[PDB]
């Protein structure tokens, strides 16, 4: 912001050269086992066990992902709902099919004049159009 | 993914501190800071107890310097006229 | 330059019939806003235009306030009074600032603010002068047709809207078509249409008759009621104080010419014109036209009327899809039950038998004495319990001791029925199940059980709409109780 | 500083039978190759079974 600052580039990277060399294992009587020897090359700003711990944490965070339409623009009245179900949805300011599809079944059961029968009707009608509650 | 994750489980009383600061740390104009020092206002906790009507009685304090003081106090979440019970703390009474 | 400001103020004042002062205040606000946009910082700015020269000074305004929240636009009263002792809370402190050069940018901003001021002055005064039009049948040109509304141009930059519900079911308008309609609502909304026009509501019919029938415009004939099925059929009720004028004949006109003009404007809607009567039964007979009514029975307590017709007239009295009875009911305000003379007699015989059975069961009287009570017009235990003793003593064969005993039995029967209702639900069912719902007092539990809501399950099945008529139950409190009942029954 | 773009299987377009096509997004400017290579080498051999 002033004219007196000077911006350098920022190489936020502590390591330089990472070389692994796999080799045979003999400590365990069982054979066909391997040893992984990683020679890193730090510039002094990072402890090596901290580096291997953060790398394993990042990789196990990455494997957490899988380890243990013009119909939306239509009014709710076009769904051929019972006069009761349509009037209950209008009372909650649900005008479009896209508004209805975002509401959960538990939210719709809190609405005034909304019975278990009218909820089943709404599901059966949405299912007939390939839509589900809570998208 | 379960195999690869199981192969990695062995790795992974003054008002406040701000009140104890000198008024010079507020980055006030040289005029506003010298006007406050002339009234023996040394700490932010002393300034916060004074009302806007009291600060306008200070010799050479203008409407512009009063607006500067408010804008700076507001940037730190402080307002003029807060009552601090037990100010100054006994740690400051000996300087 | 100078004299040009005066010439512009005079031209605009004369053309838009607007106070020069209101135009200057708005130009000052426009120039202040244009000035604020040239600074990178949010400043407060006042502009003052000299009313003789057209010269203008621009300030850094400082809203004099008690507590400063915005140091860039606000100043304390103590600091403002240091510069000028005459300043009060709500005044502005100024600061010599270079006035923005009047480029085509400021010029465009000034033009926009003038146009907006004219909408809130010239156009507002035009709408005030057209107080009749705001209510009568305005005429517009169709500017745009959407799926859900039609935008009308009224001229003078006034736009109106006809909503889909406000149109007749068979109308098809094109851009450039002329359309008449009643201005039924003027809304001062900051966005959207301000003028709402209807062709479907009853007011459109009333105002078409006011224009087509001079005797209605001269207040010689009054329209008392109008009921309408838009684009299909309507009924109007007319009265006159002048015994020399036939109000129905005046509204029909020579060979129906007047009613046919109104019908043609409404897309061929059939209009029945009926004489208003101050007797409700005679008025309903007139409203049922063209069906001939044989007899009427009035139930004042239920606000209902049973209409007997000849079996040949039944289909005409009901009309296509019940349209005739519905329009008559909307016109009279009464609920109208249309049946045959034979069905009315069968209904009265069934009601008399049910009243006799009720009196025999609860009053410990013989069937002969129960029949006399029904023939004298008593149908309920409440009538017998509460009616003045004089009316019961007018019945042949009743003495003061027997009337007192009959009233005591009727009150004891009503108390036993009320207690049996309270025991069916309110002493066991609604005293444990419906009472569990947090918020239900004993009175509300008995009010619920009087509607057949006896259990906590029955309450969980209700809508807010089913409970809305219970005295002391708000829609919010009804919704909370139904949700509490559902939480226990369906999620416990 | 330890906050990355946590990914997810946006779709499993399983083409016909005994054949799927699983797409995962978004990863870093370099993590698609390391997860593809890790899952490719493990599925190839490590994954046990009977034959």
Curated annotation (Swiss-Prot), chain B:
Acetylated on Lys-63 and Lys-64 in the presence of glucose. PatZ controls acetylation of Lys-64 but not of Lys-63. The modification N6-acetyllysine is found at residues 63-64. This is DNA-directed RNA polymerase subunit alpha. It comes from the Bacteria. The N-terminal domain is essential for RNAP assembly and basal transcription, whereas the C-terminal domain is involved in interaction with transcriptional regulators (such as CRP) and with upstream promoter elements. Belongs to the RNA polymerase alpha chain family. It comes from Escherichia coli (strain K12). DNA-dependent RNA polymerase (RNAP) catalyzes the transcription of DNA into RNA using the four ribonucleoside triphosphates as substrates. This subunit plays an important role in subunit assembly since its dimerization is the first step in the sequential assembly of subunits to form the holoenzyme. Residues 15-95 are annotated as: Alpha C-terminal domain (alpha-CTD).
Swiss-Prot record, chain C:
The N-terminal region interacts with RNAP. The central region is composed of 3 RNA binding domains, S1, KH 1 and KH 2. The C-terminal region contains 2 acidic repeats, AR1 and AR2, which bind to protein N from phage lambda during antitermination. AR2 interacts with SuhB and RNAP alpha subunit C-terminal domain (rpoA); AR2 cannot bind to both simultaneously. SuhB, NusG and the alpha-CTD of RNAP all interact with the AR2 domain and can displace the AR2 domain from the SSK domain (S1, KH1 and KH2) of NusA. Pfam families: HHH_5, KH_5, NusA_N, S1. Disruption phenotype: Mutants are sensitive to DNA-damaging agents. Residues 230-293, 302-368 form the KH domain. NCBIfam families: NusA, nusA_Cterm_rpt. Part of the processive rRNA transcription and antitermination complex (rrnTAC). The complex forms an RNA-chaperone ring around the RNA exit tunnel of RNA polymerase (RNAP). It supports rapid transcription and antitermination of rRNA operons, cotranscriptional rRNA folding, and annealing of distal rRNA regions to allow correct ribosome biogenesis. Participates in both transcription termination and antitermination. Involved in a variety of cellular termination and antitermination processes, such as Rho-dependent transcriptional termination and intrinsic termination. Residues 427-492 are annotated as: Acidic repeat 2 (AR2), required for interaction with SuhB, interacts with RNAP subunit alpha (rpoA), NusG. The keyword Oxidoreductase does not apply. This is Transcription termination/antitermination protein NusA. Induction: In response to low temperature. Negatively autoregulated. Induced by cold shock (42 to 15 degrees Celsius) (at protein level). It is found in: Cytoplasm. Sequence repeats lie at residues 364-414, 439-489. GO terms for cellular component: cytosol; transcription elongation factor complex. The lineage of its organism: Bacteria, Pseudomonadati, Pseudomonadota, Gammaproteobacteria, Enterobacterales. Changing residue 181 to D: In nusa11; inability to terminate transcription normally at termination sites. It comes from Escherichia coli (strain K12). GO terms for molecular function: bacterial-type RNA polymerase core enzyme binding; DNA-binding transcription factor activity; nucleotide binding; protein domain specific binding; RNA binding. InterPro entries: DNA_repair_Rad51/TF_NusA_a-hlx (IPR010995), KH_dom-like_a/b (IPR015946), KH_dom_NusA-like (IPR025249), KH_sf_prok-type (IPR009019), NA-bd_OB-fold (IPR012340), NusA_bac (IPR030842), NusA_N_sf (IPR036555), S1_domain (IPR003029). PROSITE patterns: KH_TYPE_1 (PS50084), S1 (PS50126). Residues 135-200 form the S1 motif domain.
């Amino acid at each position: 912001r002033p004219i007196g600052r000077l911006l350098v580039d920022a190489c936020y990277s502590p390591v330089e050269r990472i070389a692994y060399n796999v080799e045979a294992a003999r400590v365990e009587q069982r054979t066909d086992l391997d040893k992984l020897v990683i020679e890193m090359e730090t510039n002094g700003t990072i402890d090596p066990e901290e580096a291997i711990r953060r790398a394993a944490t990042i990789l196990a965070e990455q494997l957490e992902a899988f380890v243990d339409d013009p119909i939306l623009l239509r009014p709710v009245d076009d769904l051929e709902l019972t006069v009761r179900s349509a009037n209950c949805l209008k009372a909650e300011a649900i005008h479009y099919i896209g508004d209805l599809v975002q509401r959960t079944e538990v939210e719709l059961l809190k609405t005034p004049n909304l019975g278990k029968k009218s909820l089943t009707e709404i599901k059966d009608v949405l299912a007939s159009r390939g839509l589900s509650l809570g998208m | 993914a379960t195999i690869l994750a199981e192969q990695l489980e062995a790795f992974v009383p003054e008002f406040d501190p701000i009140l104890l600061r000198p008024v010079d740390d507020l980055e006030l104009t040289v005029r506003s800071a010298n006007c406050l020092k002339a009234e023996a206002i040394h700490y932010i906790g002393d300034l916060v107890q004074r009302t806007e009507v009291e600060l306008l009685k200070t010799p050479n304090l203008g409407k512009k310097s009063l607006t500067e003081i408010k804008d700076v106090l507001a940037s730190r979440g402080l307002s003029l006229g807060m009552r601090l019970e037990n100010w100054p703390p006994a740690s400051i009474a000996d300087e | 330059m100078n004299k040009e400001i005066l010439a512009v103020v005079e031209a605009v004042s004369n053309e838009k019939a607007l106070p020069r002062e209101k135009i200057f205040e708005a130009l000052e606000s426009a120039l202040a806003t244009a000035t604020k946009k040239k600074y990178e910082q949010e400043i407060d700015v006042r502009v003052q235009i000299d009313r003789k020269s057209g010269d203008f000074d621009t300030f850094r305004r400082w809203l004099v306030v008690d507590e400063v929240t915005q140091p860039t636009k606000e100043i304390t009263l103590e600091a403002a009074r240091y510069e000028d002792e005459s300043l009060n809370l709500g005044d502005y402190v100024e600061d010599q600032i270079e006035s923005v050069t009047f480029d085509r940018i400021t010029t465009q901003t000034a033009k926009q603010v003038i146009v907006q001021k004219v909408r809130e002055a010239e156009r507002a005064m035009v709408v005030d002068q057209f107080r009749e039009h705001e209510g009568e049948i305005i005429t517009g040109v169709v500017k745009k047709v959407n799926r859900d509304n039609i935008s009308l141009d009224l001229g003078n930059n006034a736009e109106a809207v006809i909503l889909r519900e406000d149109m007749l079911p068979r109308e098809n308008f094109r851009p450039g078509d002329r359309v008449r309609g009643v201005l039924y609502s003027v809304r001062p909304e900051a966005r959207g249409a301000q003028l709402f026009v209807t062709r479907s509501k009853p007011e459109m019919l009333i105002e078409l008759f006011r224009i087509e029938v001079p005797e209605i415009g001269e207040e010689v004939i009054e329209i008392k009621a109008a009921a309408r099925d838009p684009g299909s059929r309507a009924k109007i009720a007319v009265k006159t104080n002048d015994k020399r004028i036939d109000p129905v004949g005046a509204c029909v006109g020579m060979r129906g010419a007047r009613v046919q003009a109104v019908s043609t404007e409404l897309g061929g809607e059939r209009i029945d014109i009926v004489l208003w009567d101050d007797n409700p039964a005679q008025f309903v007979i007139n409203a049922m036209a063209p069906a001939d009514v044989a007899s009427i029975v009035v139930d004042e307590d239920k606000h209902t009327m049973d209409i007997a017709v000849e079996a040949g007239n039944l289909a005409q009295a009901i009309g296509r899809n019940g349209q005739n009875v519905r329009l008559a009911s909307q016109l009279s305000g009464w609920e109208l039950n249309v049946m045959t003379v034979d069905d009315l007699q069968a209904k009265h015989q069934a009601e008399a038998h049910a009243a006799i059975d009720t009196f025999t069961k609860y009053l410990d009287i013989d069937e002969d004495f129960a029949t006399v009570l029904v023939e004298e017009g008593f149908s309920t235990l409440e009538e017998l319990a509460y009616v003045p003793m004089k009316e019961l003593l007018e019945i042949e064969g009743l003495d003061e001791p027997t009337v007192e005993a009959l009233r005591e039995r009727a009150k004891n029967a009503l108390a036993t029925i009320a207690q049996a209702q309270e025991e069916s639900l309110g002493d066991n069912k609604p005293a444990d199940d419906l009472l569990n719902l947090e918020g239900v007092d004993r009175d509300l539990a008995f009010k619920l059980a009087a509607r057949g809501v006896c259990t906590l399950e029955d309450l969980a099945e209700q809508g807010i709409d089913d409970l809305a008529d219970i005295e002391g139950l708000t829609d919010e409190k009804a919704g909370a109780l139904i949700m509490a009942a559902r939480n226990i029954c369906w999620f416990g | 500083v330890t906050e990355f773009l946590k990914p997810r299987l946006v779709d499993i377009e399983q083409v016909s039978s005994t054949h799927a096509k699983v797409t995962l997004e978004p990863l870093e400017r370099g993590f698609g190759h390391t997860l593809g290579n890790a899952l490719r080498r493990i599925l190839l051999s490590s994954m046990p079974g009977c034959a």
